Structures are given as C-alpha cells and as structure tokens.
Amino acid sequence: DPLSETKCTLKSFTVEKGIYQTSNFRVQPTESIVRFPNITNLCPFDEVFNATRFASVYAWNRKRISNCVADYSVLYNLAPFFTFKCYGVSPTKLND
C-alpha cells in the first residue's frame, strides 16, 4: 500500500498528518530490441593469424579489416593460445 510505504520511508509506525515523497514512478520496459548491420560475410582474421610466413619487427605489416562479421570465439579457443591480455576491454564481452 502507498500508506505502508510512508511507514517504511520515515521508519515510524505512527505517521502524522502531512505530505511525504516516498519514491518515484518509472515505467519499466516490456520488450527487448537489438539492431546490428545486415552483413554476414567472414573476414580474413584467420588468414592474418594462421599465415605461413610473418613480417619482422621493422616495416611491420598492417591488414585493413573492415566490413565483415567478426567472431572472436573461434580465435581464443585454440590450444597454443596461452596468454590473452587486453587493454581497456574485457576479453569475454568482445562479440557484443
């Protein structure tokens, strides 16, 4: 009851005459929506990681990765992938 909420707010069973602000109204959502772009194609994350030969320290190669559906869950499930340290990002919430 709204009268019982005044007894919990002021912490007293005998509530005197007056006006009291107990709580605030808030309409909670009933549905849940998510929108992602219409792409489906996979991009060469596998080719950059599992290439045959690699570049040296100087003149490093940089692959432009854009317009794909990324999927990191196929990356860090590999057996020689020992360490995985991230910066400003948690390693588990990478797919979202």
Partner 1 sequence: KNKCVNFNFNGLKGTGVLTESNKKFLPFQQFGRDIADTTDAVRDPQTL
Partner 2 sequence: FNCYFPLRSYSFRPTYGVGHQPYRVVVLSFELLHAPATVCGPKKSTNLV
Partner 3 sequence: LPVSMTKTSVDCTMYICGDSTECSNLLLQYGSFCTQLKRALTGIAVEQD
Applying CB under 8 A, which residues contact partner 2?
A: 79-80, 82
d(CA 31, CA 47): 40
Binding mask 25-44 for partner 3 (x = CB under 8 A): -x------------------
Q: Rule CB under 8 A: is residue 21 a binding residue for partner 3?
A: yes
Enter the tokens of residue 37: 């772009």
Residue 80 contact among partner 1, partner 3, partner 2, none, beta carbon within 5 to 8 Å by kind: partner 2
Secondary structure (3-state) at 86: coil
> Which of 2/37 has CB closer to partner 1?
37
| Tally of CA atoms within 13 A in the half-sphere of 21 that contains its CB | 2
d(CA 96, CA 92): 9
Q: Rule CB under 8 A: is residue 24 a binding residue for partner 3?
A: yes
> Which of 60/82 has CB closer to partner 2?
82
Give the amino acid at 11. Answer: K
